[PDB]
Design a protein around this nucleic acid. Structure first.
Ligand SMILES: [Mg+2]
Lengths: 98, 50, 49, 50, 74, 147, 50, 98
DNA sequence: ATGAATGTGCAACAGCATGATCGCGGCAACGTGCAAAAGTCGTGCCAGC
RNA sequence: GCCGCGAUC
DNA sequence: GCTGGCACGACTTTTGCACTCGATCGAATGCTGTTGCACATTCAT
């Protein structure tokens, strides 16, 4: 993901060893394909083929982390948008602060 | 030995659902027993089987 | 609280009858059913703390 | 319903995208097994029995 | 009653934090231990809180300081 | 609750899917792994002294021929227990560096894709803490009765 | 024979409850042409040509 | 209270009118295409048997009165009532978000 | 001039194709004989009127 | 717990 | 003296028990994406 690459590039460039930063090549995907490739498995398993997504999520042993809106709707918590966005902002600081 | 609450305390804090393969020992951990008969209920007493 | 919270429904009904209008939400039974269904396969799903 | 008999079709001429129109025949009976004749892009007689 | 919340919205302009502030104020006025700061005209607590916000007499900062003062008194 | 199958059977989640997990883990095609699963053909393991390969696909007739000629040192099974036996024997960590060396030493646009996929799966397995023998299950859980 | 005949008459794709609002509904239901049924085609199956 | 609500005395009607006074209720149509397809109104009780919809919001709902039906969902929480008043009221969303 | 590796092209298999309502019907998979125990039935008992 | 059939927008 | 609910010695029921043998079908939706296999081509000796 470009967002994951951007923070790694910024962190590597922040330190003295700026040459460690790796150049990338941006890619374009269709909606049916880009949606299924999201880093969270709870989403993209409630839209298209679930047999494929679960196994590729089962063997990898990944986590969902409930970052988007689809994941929070399924669980039943407050979505991180609008009135529920403020509540998810307060919770983030507490988790980071320990 | 009274005043015990299990329905309300069933709601526990959580985050970051995790998915992984299930081990046979882990599967046995979930299970609380065995199933060895293919019948569902005995009509002689309208009760669940053994 | 309207669909799948077994305790949430009763709690919020009591709150309305009292006149509290308090949310007091919980965990839907549908997701627990889905978790049990997936666990019934060879895939293990659990909720991390 | 479709009347039993002999039906010829051209499959609209767009299967292999090469512009080759492919003619096929069908033997639809009232009861029993089917029988078809099919034209390849390479002009080969293929029979799709049942 | 308030047919539109635009006057209340422009006081604390987010259209999202206003809902939270009004919910907190309505909870305070409904569960007990609070009295409206604006004359009440047979309407429910929600619009009373919204009218308090629109008049500029209820805000998040002053809600926090009122809670702090109540805690200090006790 | 659970039920013991008294014999290891294969999961269709990992066997029958277009990116078959056991298919690309074992470097054998889906047709072969489906054939051995239904006892149509045998698969031998170990057999260093004999001329049989590690992942041979010898049939029944080849099985009696090997028994007549090789006799011992031929370890062949027809069920999914053979899959368990060969999966336990696999050293994931040792294979990781071997395929990495093969990929970097020889460059070709055809084998590179399959090699990268296998390396990614192996790295994911070793990092996730899972084990490959758990794909085929010996104890099958059951749904709660109320559901 | 009775089982098959009653199965056809009672539970079939082309033996439905008759409409009874006005004589017109009965008249237009009795002389109805249906392309579906056992030997017919599925609703999803029908293209624009049919 | 149950028995007298079933018996529907006049005081029950008066108390229902007292409860309804400023509790916004949100109506929606079946194919909710865009975000304007579910709007929150302020109910006025009528001696009738059908929902009376304001003619202006018909364009937003894409509803015409030839047998169309709409669902009536009740927001029953203080946060929900504020959300249905400050975010979903018909007078609030006049400009289409497209 | 010929063999092998590679890239390209073709064929078979898998997933997927709107939302919300209302009304009528029809509708699946044993046995066995003895111990061992338990329950039961015909019978005799004391306690209340 | 559905399957067919019909109907409304 | 008359009458009505309690126990005992046979009868009678149940259960573990785990142990065996035992045709007729509908075939007809495109649309796309993916994986495997066969063949044409080109390079090396
Ligand atoms: Mg209409």
């Amino acid at each position: 993901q470009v967002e994951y690459s951007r923070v790694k590039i910024a962190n590597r460039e922040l330190e003295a060893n700026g040459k460690v930063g790796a150049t990338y090549s941006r890619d374009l995907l269709g909606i049916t394909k880009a949606s299924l490739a999201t880093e969270s498995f709870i989403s993209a398993a409630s839209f298209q083929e679930t047999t494929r997504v679960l196994t590729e999520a089962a063997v990898a042993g990944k986590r969902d982390e409930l970052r988007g809106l689809k994941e929070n709707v399924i669980v039943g918590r407050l979505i991180p948008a609008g009135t529920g966005y403020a509540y998810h902002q307060d919770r983030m600081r507490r988790r980071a602060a320990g | 030995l009274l005043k015990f609450l299990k329905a309300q305390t069933k709601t526990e804090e959580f985050d970051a659902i995790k998915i992984a393969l299930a081990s046979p020992d882990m599967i046995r951990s979930w299970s609380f027993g065995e199933v060895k008969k293919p019948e569902t209920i005995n009509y002689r007493t309208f009760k669940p089987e053994r | 609280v309207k669909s799948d919270d077994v305790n949430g429904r009763t709690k919020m009904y009591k709150n309305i009858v009292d006149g509290n209008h308090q949310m007091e939400p919980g965990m839907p039974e549908s997701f627990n059913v889905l978790l049990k269904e997936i666990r019934s396969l060879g895939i293990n799903i659990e909720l991390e703390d | 319903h479709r009347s039993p008999g002999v039906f010829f079709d051209s499959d609209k001429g767009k299967t292999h995208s090469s512009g080759k129109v492919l003619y096929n025949a069908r033997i639809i009976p009232y009861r029993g097994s089917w029988l078809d004749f099919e034209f390849d892009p390479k002009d080969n007689l293929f029979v799709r029995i049942d | 009653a308030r047919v539109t919340v635009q006057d209340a919205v422009e006081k604390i302009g987010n259209r999202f934090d206003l809902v939270l502030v009004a919910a907190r104020r309505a909870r305070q006025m409904q569960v007990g231990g609070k009295d409206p700061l604006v004359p009440e005209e047979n309407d429910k607590t929600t619009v009373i809180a919204l009218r308090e916000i629109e008049e500029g007499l209820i805000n998040n900062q002053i809600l926090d300081v009122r809670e702090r003062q109540e805690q200090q008194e006790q | 609750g659970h039920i013991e199958l008294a014999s290891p059977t294969a999961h269709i989640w990992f066997l029958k899917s277009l990116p078959s997990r056991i298919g690309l883990l074992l470097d054998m095609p889906l047709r072969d792994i489906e054939r051995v699963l239904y006892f149509e053909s045998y698969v031998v393991i170990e057999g260093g002294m004999t001329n049989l390969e590690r992942q041979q696909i010898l049939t029944e007739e080849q099985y009696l021929d090997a028994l007549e000629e090789f006799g011992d040192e031929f370890d062949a099974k027809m069920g999914a227990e053979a899959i368990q036996a060969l999966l336990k024997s696999m050293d994931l960590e040792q294979e990781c560096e071997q395929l990495r060396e093969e990929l970097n030493e020889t460059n070709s646009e055809t084998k590179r894709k399959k090699l990268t996929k296998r390396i990614k799966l192996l790295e994911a397995f070793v990092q996730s803490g899972n084990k490959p023998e758990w794909m085929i299950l010996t104890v099958l859980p059951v749904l709660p009765p109320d559901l | 024979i009775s089982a098959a005949v009653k199965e056809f008459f009672g539970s079939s794709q082309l033996s439905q409850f008759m409409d009874q609002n006005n004589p017109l509904s009965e008249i237009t239901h009795k002389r109805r042409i249906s392309a579906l049924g056992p030997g017919g085609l599925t609703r999803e199956r029908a293209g624009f040509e049919v | 209270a149950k028995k007298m609500v079933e018996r529907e005395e006049a005081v029950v009607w008066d108390i229902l009118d007292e409860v309804i006074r400023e509790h916004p209720v949100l109506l929606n149509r079946a194919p909710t295409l865009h975000r304007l397809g579910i709007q929150a109104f302020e109910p006025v009780l009528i001696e009738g048997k059908a929902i009376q919809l304001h003619p202006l919001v018909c364009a937003a709902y894409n509803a015409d009165f030839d047998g169309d039906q709409m669902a009536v969902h009740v927001p029953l929480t203080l946060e929900a009532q504020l959300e249905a008043r400050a975010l979903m009221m018909s007078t609030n969303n006049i400009l289409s978000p497209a």
